Amino acid sequence: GEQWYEKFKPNCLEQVAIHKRKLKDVQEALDAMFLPNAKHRILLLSGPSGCSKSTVIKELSKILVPKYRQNKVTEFRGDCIVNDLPQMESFSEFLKGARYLVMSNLSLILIEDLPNVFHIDTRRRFQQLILQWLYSSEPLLPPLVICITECEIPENDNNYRKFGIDYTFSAETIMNKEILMHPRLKRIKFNPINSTLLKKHLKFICVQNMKMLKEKNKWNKRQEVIDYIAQETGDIRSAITTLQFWATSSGSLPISTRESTISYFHAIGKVIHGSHSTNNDNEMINNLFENSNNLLSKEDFKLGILENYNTFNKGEFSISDASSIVDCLSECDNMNGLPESNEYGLREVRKTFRNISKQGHNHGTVYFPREWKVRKLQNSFKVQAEDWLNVSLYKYNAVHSFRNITLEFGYYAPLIRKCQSYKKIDVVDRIGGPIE
Amino acid sequence: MKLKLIVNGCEAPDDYKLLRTTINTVASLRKTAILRFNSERLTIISTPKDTGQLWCTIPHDVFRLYTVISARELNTITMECNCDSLLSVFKRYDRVMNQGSSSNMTIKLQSPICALGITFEEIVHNKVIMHSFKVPVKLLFRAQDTRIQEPMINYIQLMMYKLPPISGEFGSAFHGFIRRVERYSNVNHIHLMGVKVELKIIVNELDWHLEICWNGPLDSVISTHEVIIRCKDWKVCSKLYAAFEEVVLAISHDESCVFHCSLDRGRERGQIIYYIA
Amino acid sequence: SLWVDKYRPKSLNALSHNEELTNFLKSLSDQPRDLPHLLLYGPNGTGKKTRCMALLESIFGPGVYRLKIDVRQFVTASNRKLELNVVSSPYHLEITPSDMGNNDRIVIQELLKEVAQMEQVDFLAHRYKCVIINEANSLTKDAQAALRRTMEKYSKNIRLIMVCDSMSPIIAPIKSRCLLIRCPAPSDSEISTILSDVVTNERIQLETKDILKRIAQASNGNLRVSLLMLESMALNNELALKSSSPIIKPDWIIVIHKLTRKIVKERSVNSLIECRAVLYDLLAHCIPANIILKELTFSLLDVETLNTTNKSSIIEYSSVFDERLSLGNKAIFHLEGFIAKVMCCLD
Amino acid sequence: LSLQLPWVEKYRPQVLSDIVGNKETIDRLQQIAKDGNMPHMIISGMPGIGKTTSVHCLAHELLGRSYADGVLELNASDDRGIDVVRNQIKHFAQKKLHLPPGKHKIVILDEADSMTAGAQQALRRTMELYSNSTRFAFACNQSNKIIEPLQSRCAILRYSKLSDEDVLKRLLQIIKLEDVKYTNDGLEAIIFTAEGDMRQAINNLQSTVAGHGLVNADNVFKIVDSPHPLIVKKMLLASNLEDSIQILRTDLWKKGYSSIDIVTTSFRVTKNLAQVKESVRLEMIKEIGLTHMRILEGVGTYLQLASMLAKIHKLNNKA
Amino acid sequence: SKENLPWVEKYRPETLDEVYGQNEVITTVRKFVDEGKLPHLLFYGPPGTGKTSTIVALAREIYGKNYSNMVLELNASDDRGIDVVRNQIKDFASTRQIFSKGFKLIILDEADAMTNAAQNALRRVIERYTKNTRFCVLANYAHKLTPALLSRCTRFRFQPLPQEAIERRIANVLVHEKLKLSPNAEKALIELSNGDMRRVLNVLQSCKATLDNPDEDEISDDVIYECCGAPRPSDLKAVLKSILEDDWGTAHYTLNKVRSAKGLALIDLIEGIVKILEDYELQNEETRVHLLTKLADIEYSISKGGNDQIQGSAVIGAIKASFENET
DNA sequence: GATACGAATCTTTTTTTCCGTATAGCCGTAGC
DNA sequence: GCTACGGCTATACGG
DNA sequence: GATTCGTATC
Numbered sequence A: 001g002e003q004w005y006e007k008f009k010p011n012c013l014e015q016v017a018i019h020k021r022k023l024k025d026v027q028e029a030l031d032a033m034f035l036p037n038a039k040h041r042i043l044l045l046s047g048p049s050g051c052s053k054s055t056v057i058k059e060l061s062k063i064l065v066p067k068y069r070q071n072k073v074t075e076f077r078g079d080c081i082v083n084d085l086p087q088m089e090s091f092s093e094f095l096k097g098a099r100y101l102v103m104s105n106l107s108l109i110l111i112e113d114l115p116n117v118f119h120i121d122t123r124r125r126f127q128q129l130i131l132q133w134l135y136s137s138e139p140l141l142p143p144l145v146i147c148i149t150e151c152e153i154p155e156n157d158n159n160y161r162k163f164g165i166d167y168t169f170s171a172e173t174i175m176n177k178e179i180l181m182h183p184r185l186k187r188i189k190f191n192p193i194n195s196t197l198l199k200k201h202l203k204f205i206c207v208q209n210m211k212m213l214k215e216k217n218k219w220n221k222r223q224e225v226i227d228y229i230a231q232e233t234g235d236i237r238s239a240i241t242t243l244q245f246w247a248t249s250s251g252s253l254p255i256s257t258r259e260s261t262i263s264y265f266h267a268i269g270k271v272i273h274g275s276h277s278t279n280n281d282n283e284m285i286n287n288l289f290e291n292s293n294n295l296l297s298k299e300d301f302k303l304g305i306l307e308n309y310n311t312f313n314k315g316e317f318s319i320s321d322a323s324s325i326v327d328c329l330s331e332c333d334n335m336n337g338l339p340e341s342n343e344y345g346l347r348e349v350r351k352t353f354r355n356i357s358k359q360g361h362n363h364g365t366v367y368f369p370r371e372w373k374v375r376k377l378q379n380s381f382k383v384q385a386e387d388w389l390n391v392s393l394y395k396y397n398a399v400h401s402f403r404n405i406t407l408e409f410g411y412y413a414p415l416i417r418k419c420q421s422y423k424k425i426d427v428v429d430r431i432g433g434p435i436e
Numbered sequence B: 001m002k003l004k005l006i007v008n009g010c011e012a013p014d015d016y017k018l019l020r021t022t023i024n025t026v027a028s029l030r031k032t033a034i035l036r037f038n039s040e041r042l043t044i045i046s047t048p049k050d051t052g053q054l055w056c057t058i059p060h061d062v063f064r065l066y067t068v069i070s071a072r073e074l075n076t077i078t079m080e081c082n083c084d085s086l087l088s089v090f091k092r093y094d095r096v097m098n099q100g101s102s103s104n105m106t107i108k109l110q111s112p113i114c115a116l117g118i119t120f121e122e123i124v125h126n127k128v129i130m131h132s133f134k135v136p137v138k139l140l141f142r143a144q145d146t147r148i149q150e151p152m153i154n155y156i157q158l159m160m161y162k163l164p165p166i167s168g169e170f171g172s173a174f175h176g177f178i179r180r181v182e183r184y185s186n187v188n189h190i191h192l193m194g195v196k197v198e199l200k201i202i203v204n205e206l207d208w209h210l211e212i213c214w215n216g217p218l219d220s221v222i223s224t225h226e227v228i229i230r231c232k233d234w235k236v237c238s239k240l241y242a243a244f245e246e247v248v249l250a251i252s253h254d255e256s257c258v259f260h261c262s263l264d265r266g267r268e269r270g271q272i273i274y275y276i277a
Numbered sequence C: 001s002l003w004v005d006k007y008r009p010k011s012l013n014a015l016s017h018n019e020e021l022t023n024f025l026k027s028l029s030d031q032p033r034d035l036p037h038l039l040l041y042g043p044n045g046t047g048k049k050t051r052c053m054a055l056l057e058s059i060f061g062p063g064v065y066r067l068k069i070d071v072r073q074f075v076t077a078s079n080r081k082l083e084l085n086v087v088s089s090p091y092h093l094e095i096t097p098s099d100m101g102n103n104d105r106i107v108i109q110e111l112l113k114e115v116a117q118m119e120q121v122d123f124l125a126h127r128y129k130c131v132i133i134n135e136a137n138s139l140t141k142d143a144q145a146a147l148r149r150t151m152e153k154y155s156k157n158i159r160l161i162m163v164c165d166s167m168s169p170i171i172a173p174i175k176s177r178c179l180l181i182r183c184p185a186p187s188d189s190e191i192s193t194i195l196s197d198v199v200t201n202e203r204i205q206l207e208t209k210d211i212l213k214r215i216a217q218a219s220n221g222n223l224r225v226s227l228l229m230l231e232s233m234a235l236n237n238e239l240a241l242k243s244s245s246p247i248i249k250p251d252w253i254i255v256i257h258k259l260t261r262k263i264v265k266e267r268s269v270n271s272l273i274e275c276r277a278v279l280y281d282l283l284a285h286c287i288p289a290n291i292i293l294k295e296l297t298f299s300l301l302d303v304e305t306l307n308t309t310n311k312s313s314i315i316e317y318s319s320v321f322d323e324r325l326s327l328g329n330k331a332i333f334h335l336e337g338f339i340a341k342v343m344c345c346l347d
Numbered sequence D: 001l002s003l004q005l006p007w008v009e010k011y012r013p014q015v016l017s018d019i020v021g022n023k024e025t026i027d028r029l030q031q032i033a034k035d036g037n038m039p040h041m042i043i044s045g046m047p048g049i050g051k052t053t054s055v056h057c058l059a060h061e062l063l064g065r066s067y068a069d070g071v072l073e074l075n076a077s078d079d080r081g082i083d084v085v086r087n088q089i090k091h092f093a094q095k096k097l098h099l100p101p102g103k104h105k106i107v108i109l110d111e112a113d114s115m116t117a118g119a120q121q122a123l124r125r126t127m128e129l130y131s132n133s134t135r136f137a138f139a140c141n142q143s144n145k146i147i148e149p150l151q152s153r154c155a156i157l158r159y160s161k162l163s164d165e166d167v168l169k170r171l172l173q174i175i176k177l178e179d180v181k182y183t184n185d186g187l188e189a190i191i192f193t194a195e196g197d198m199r200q201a202i203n204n205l206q207s208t209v210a211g212h213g214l215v216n217a218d219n220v221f222k223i224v225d226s227p228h229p230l231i232v233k234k235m236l237l238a239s240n241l242e243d244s245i246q247i248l249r250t251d252l253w254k255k256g257y258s259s260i261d262i263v264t265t266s267f268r269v270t271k272n273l274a275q276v277k278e279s280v281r282l283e284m285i286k287e288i289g290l291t292h293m294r295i296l297e298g299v300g301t302y303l304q305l306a307s308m309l310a311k312i313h314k315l316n317n318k319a
Numbered sequence E: 001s002k003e004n005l006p007w008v009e010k011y012r013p014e015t016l017d018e019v020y021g022q023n024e025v026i027t028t029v030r031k032f033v034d035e036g037k038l039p040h041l042l043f044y045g046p047p048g049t050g051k052t053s054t055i056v057a058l059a060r061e062i063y064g065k066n067y068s069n070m071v072l073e074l075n076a077s078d079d080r081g082i083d084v085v086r087n088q089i090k091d092f093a094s095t096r097q098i099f100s101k102g103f104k105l106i107i108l109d110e111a112d113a114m115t116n117a118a119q120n121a122l123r124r125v126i127e128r129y130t131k132n133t134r135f136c137v138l139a140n141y142a143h144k145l146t147p148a149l150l151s152r153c154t155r156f157r158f159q160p161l162p163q164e165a166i167e168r169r170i171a172n173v174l175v176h177e178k179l180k181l182s183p184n185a186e187k188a189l190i191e192l193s194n195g196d197m198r199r200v201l202n203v204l205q206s207c208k209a210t211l212d213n214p215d216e217d218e219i220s221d222d223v224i225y226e227c228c229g230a231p232r233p234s235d236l237k238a239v240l241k242s243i244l245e246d247d248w249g250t251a252h253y254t255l256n257k258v259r260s261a262k263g264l265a266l267i268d269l270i271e272g273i274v275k276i277l278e279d280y281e282l283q284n285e286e287t288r289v290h291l292l293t294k295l296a297d298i299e300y301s302i303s304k305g306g307n308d309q310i311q312g313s314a315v316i317g318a319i320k321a322s323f324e325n326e327t
Numbered sequence F: 001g002a003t004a005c006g007a008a009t010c011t012t013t014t015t016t017t018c019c020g021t022a023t024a025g026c027c028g029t030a031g032c
Numbered sequence G: 001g002c003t004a005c006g007g008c009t010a011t012a013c014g015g
Numbered sequence H: 001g002a003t004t005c006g007t008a009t010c
């Protein structure tokens, strides 16, 4: 009378569906942070849902905490409304009370259910408190493990001012660059469960439910079910749920599992090189648009197509095809973000790369668009030109426009100030650097 | 650059309360204030550079000690100080003298960013408690000092009105007149009027029109004069008039408004001018 | 100091380029009461701003060249707390709202609606304050729609003298309410005469006066560019213009020329990626994409190894992709499309 | 007036045996209702195929007389914020109502696709801690609008479009309980205009019997029109231009369909159009989008639609 | 005070018997009312077809003098967000009926302007309170409505008004205003109407204002064409004859003379010549394609401004270069 | 010993409504 | 018995 | 989805 993913949970560490290398790395990290003076203070675990990110920690605790504890885990509970406690200080109070968990009361603090990081005011408090923990002057602190599930936030708001947290729920949209790149933060990213451990740990459940599966004559079509489930999903919880829903059934209901969200580089590779399952490009494009519209209907995707279409043959394809790709991508930019623009700019590229698709082609490695660096260099140029205009109007009396600066006074004036002043405080080098 | 002054609130109540009148106004207007310590006179300035400007003149005889030397012209050094800290210190001294005391303020310029050593004493009841404070300030440059000048006001054939003193029979009536418009929450513009003597507070909007009037006697020492002003400036005018007996109101036709306040210390008279655009 | 801003004429009689444009500006300044709204259009570097300053000097007297700079704060709907510097002076005001960005509406609806409702009654002539809008062609078509009625209704107390080049992206209502003043660029003779004035004033020793002619033809009717070139050449040659003095050119011009040479020589996908890298490098320096496309086209049309068919294809693709960029958001797509089309047509 | 309910509400099934369609799913729901152990489920599909009346009937049968204090139905008309998830759902889960063995409390979160992200992330903990007493039944039209961690703990039940025989059976049941005169062609026309939507079949049948009484092809097609996607498909799959312009004008312009509606339906039809080369399909998408931009800018005229059809035929004949 | 109203609002049908054109919808909603069951209705059609009049007349017939307290009319002029959907519509549907013993009516006009968040929250409001409240949705663009809201409401299509209905309303307007309309002017009004009665009334009012004596003179075709500024049916064929039969020197002169005799606009001539050429028997299948794809581009360029003479010559060029295919 | 499999890498800064906090107004109670 | 002030609370604002 | 490196296993 219970769900099979709760009645067949691992009791030891050897029944956890995790890769051996991943388990070993997590073991080494966790054993490192339990030492008196640990280099790492917070262990961040990223990955998709059901990758045993919390099924390995809650069984490593039972073997590691009662080894360094002088004589389990302390999960943070978001739904705890204390009287006289505003809903932004709950995590602060939890951290303040969790810093006393040291020897003679040692416990590893696990943060799986993060605070309401979808609100702009408490996400900042979350980041600030984590930074305070990472920069804490306390010589002795308990180990901290944060498990963040990488899931795509569905489109619900109606605004083009959507931030990172309104597109993807990942460790980058919750933690700033300083926390992620902090020297005392070890990040062990996880991967979906492969088709081998999923095929073994489900046959375990089947041979435990031997009686029920034999009574309903569900023992000759067993492997055809475990193999299909493992080939469809990389989830340890949804696979067990589907197995229970199929074994408890008494008919021919077609089994189903949760759908996976195609990533950014995954979708770029699907558009450029094509999918290995469907040979019909129309069906693939329609399913990509109906399953990953939050990613296709953006600008970074159309920029990545332009930045990665040269990796089909490592640049060894006809220029007449490259022109047919870029002219369509440019015609799509004038459609003002209409839904008929992305569906054309993703179909023309796929058709172009399909018409030249032959075996023996050694493809290249895709990369993220470089427009984010161009914008930062542009902002640096803006600041330098503002400084040039400021110094040219208080040490002198002359008003000049920004366009004139970028065209003539961003190069000629640095040379003049290098010869008139330096040769025989100020600006002497080219604005925003040379043209290299 | 050596600056040192001594203030005694109990010794002289008028010049001291005008100092309270200047500090409260520069606190209510905006953060930070400009203090130019001329060798013969002080001037406390709050320049937002549409928003109004206050120019209060403080003489040198108000304080017991006014030793001021600097390398600039006429021993002028100009401070930029956060008004919250000095307002808190000043309120602390107000409570010090309210509990019963007669101690003086020793304010010294102790070190471009500097600070003022505002130290005083308090006695509870025959105990010695020393209150030491340090308000961080910045040194304004002489070139930066000359960029700040008092706004000019002319009346070729305009109209200044003598507001009745608040100590008289009509003073409370006129104070109620000025504060009547402040009761409404949804007011942002007031249209002052000048007839030669009646002045009216008119607030006309899309669907409602205030038209408050003063039927009491008025004086104009020795034509229409209307101006559109903000409500916050009217609140500042109310606060300035509440602490002044001699208040001078001059209205320009669609150019500006000036709230002139003066205290007759006679001796140089301390004056507060609120330029309003 | 910069020789551009040290020999700038400060009066209508000190402006020696076009005698016909000075005689028309003097006619405009004869009766300043009925001065209409003016739109000065012409090639860059002609001196339209200098002539506007001279007209303001002839109207309001001297004192229009003492500029005080104050920064005004504007708040959008999202409370972004935007910023804009407002160069001003007695009798006139100068604004380049296009710098604010796409929020230029929030400044032409505040500054141009607050100084047009002041009436400038000082102590009785109300007069008018002249507002110069630099780069009038960069407005986002919403700043102009909120400006047409603004300058039509309040024309009594304000006058607008907008300075722009290539007044195509200016809407028809704005051009209808504004008197259009064309400012032709000087010929090489006038530029050479001006450069002669500078060199005798600065006492630099030139030889073979033909050098000033060379600077005039290299500047392409740009007095600012010609003066900057002259100053750079004199400083690099130690105030001695030798007959073999190198005519220095902007670095981005040389890089665009190298890009054209790469396009002509190498026509492949990898060469296209290198061209994208060069284009991104140029874009990182706040160089407008329209100007980059124009320079690329007119440098590819100067190649002597290309026939008439290739040049016609290049100019057709240039027009098509320029129109595409004018109605687009990301210019890298259009620039890559133009380069790829040129590469495909050349081979 | 009268208290006579519309037949959509008058003939809403109150038992799981009256819900037609998806037999393999309804039978499993009945098996759950008899056994008792109800897993967390997400029921998704097209509108009007019986996703709400299935969950409600399952909860009713599973809880018996404890339905009033054993279910918590939270729809989009209620404030399904994070505070409600943290307080009301938490207190309903913490309730200790005693039930027959195998039975569980059911939280029917209908229209869960409109729920915010933080509410779903709190629901994660809500179903994690309190899973032995209460069960969550999400009902949506799109499964991807529920976050992946929430979909992991649930069992996905994908309802499909109803066929032409299940809808016919339910319509015959209604016509037998309402003494409605009918003809076979009229019922077939009702099925054709329903497009696998039982609600839009009941509504059309009620409108036809109210307006004319007898359910024939004429009385049906004179009150409810043929589906406009199937006319747009006929217009976009013609051979000549003079035969596509006729179907455009006389069947979409003089009938009252807006040009923007025609273009929006044309894009959807082109996306699902079969037996068409992919280059032709993408060119048709581009030409439809170019006309969509013009219509959105203001020029929503019949001449623009004619030009779009002409360009589609141009790309069809050679390009 | 009703005589100081515009003719569009002065002649608004107060009862269901004054709504012309739509017959299969009126004769269905009347049977719905008489039977006693009114389902959730959706009214769809072009502007000026009579949807907002039909629903108000229907509710007036249903409730009589209790229209004010039993009808919640919400339109695009109100902030019909999700908060309003949950805080006004929900408690209007939840509360019991006020003495009428029947159902309440919630009329959501211009529902295509409602957000998807406010439309996905009205679905269960409609479904739950069907017994004591009903919903009518009026829209002209059905692509902005969510599919579930489109499925919960019975759909009634308001066709463009036929010629007979427009002429019968024109007769009533002429009777009330004591006006006279020529037989050749009624056809012109119907043709320019494009199935809109608001255009009928707005043109007839200006025609009455144009007449010097509105009690003796008659509104001829000249009066209509001068008031609405449309080309005459002869000026639309003379220009086409010049373009398709004359040279490039006299066709331009004829076009510029037609556009200057009465100040006709280029777009009106384009849209008239398009209708004239649509009846042609062009036997190339490419002449029609070229004509459509070029005249649509000229029409799109006209809407954004530009040189008028250049576009006028472009029309002549596009019509001339296309028939070269046919020949 | 061949091969299937698996991990790592390929990355980033107009509008509407909602969730939590700031703040002024009003009422209850101590004390002068 | 009356008033000032602290605590509670409803409401507009901000990201 | 592509390449490259590294295992485990049959």
Ligand SMILES: Nc1ncnc2c1ncn2[C@@H]1O[C@H](COP(=O)(O)OP(=O)(O)OP(O)(O)=S)[C@@H](O)[C@H]1O
Pocket (backbone or CB within 6 Å): A005, A006, A008, A009, A010, A015, A016, A017, A018, A048, A049, A050, A051, A052, A053, A054, A055, A056, A112, A147, A149, A201, A236, A237, A240, D148, D149, D150, D152
């Ligand atoms: N062999 C197994 N290995 C791992 N998990 C198992 C196994 N058998 C059952 N489970 C259950 O599967 C679930 C996996 O949960 P976890 O992956 O640890 O949590 P998670 O990674 O945070 O997933 P989310 O993001 O919270 S949905 C737990 O409820 C386990 O009890």
Ligand SMILES: Nc1ncnc2c1ncn2[C@@H]1O[C@H](COP(=O)(O)OP(=O)(O)OP(O)(O)=S)[C@@H](O)[C@H]1O
Pocket (backbone or CB within 6 Å): D007, D008, D009, D011, D012, D013, D018, D019, D020, D021, D046, D047, D048, D049, D050, D051, D052, D053, D054, D140, D141, D162, D170, D198, D199, D202, E148, E151
């Ligand atoms: N399979 C079915 N058997 C019988 N009636 C059905 C069936 N499907 C729908 N209906 C009718 O549809 C109406 C109820 O529709 P619902 O089941 O609430 O819709 P739904 O499928 O949940 O779609 P949404 O998500 O609410 S738009 C009643 O009139 C039912 O009789």
Ligand SMILES: Nc1ncnc2c1ncn2[C@@H]1O[C@H](COP(=O)(O)OP(=O)(O)OP(O)(O)=S)[C@@H](O)[C@H]1O
Pocket (backbone or CB within 6 Å): E007, E008, E009, E010, E011, E012, E013, E018, E019, E020, E021, E022, E045, E046, E047, E048, E049, E050, E051, E052, E053, E054, E139, E140, E169, E197, E198
């Ligand atoms: N069938 C009709 N019979 C008589 N007058 C009509 C008819 N249809 C429209 N009208 C007139 O046109 C006016 C406007 O029509 P409405 O019904 O108010 O608006 P509408 O037809 O619903 O168009 P939209 O979609 O609201 S813009 C009415 O007030 C009538 O005067």
Ligand SMILES: Nc1ncnc2c1ncn2[C@@H]1O[C@H](COP(=O)(O)OP(=O)(O)O)[C@@H](O)[C@H]1O
Pocket (backbone or CB within 6 Å): C003, C004, C005, C007, C008, C009, C014, C015, C016, C017, C042, C043, C044, C045, C046, C047, C048, C049, C050, C051, C194, C223, C224, C227
């Ligand atoms: N008549 C003239 N005589 C000398 N120099 C001139 C003259 N007209 C313009 N200039 C030069 O042009 C420069 C300014 O050009 P600018 O006003 O920026 O041109 P534009 O208005 O076309 O951008 C000045 O430095 C000035 O030296």
Ligand SMILES: [Mg+2]
Pocket (backbone or CB within 6 Å): A054, A055, A112
């Ligand atoms: Mg977990």
Ligand SMILES: [Mg+2]
Pocket (backbone or CB within 6 Å): D052, E127
């Ligand atoms: Mg439902």
Ligand SMILES: [Mg+2]
Pocket (backbone or CB within 6 Å): E051, E052, E109
């Ligand atoms: Mg209407």
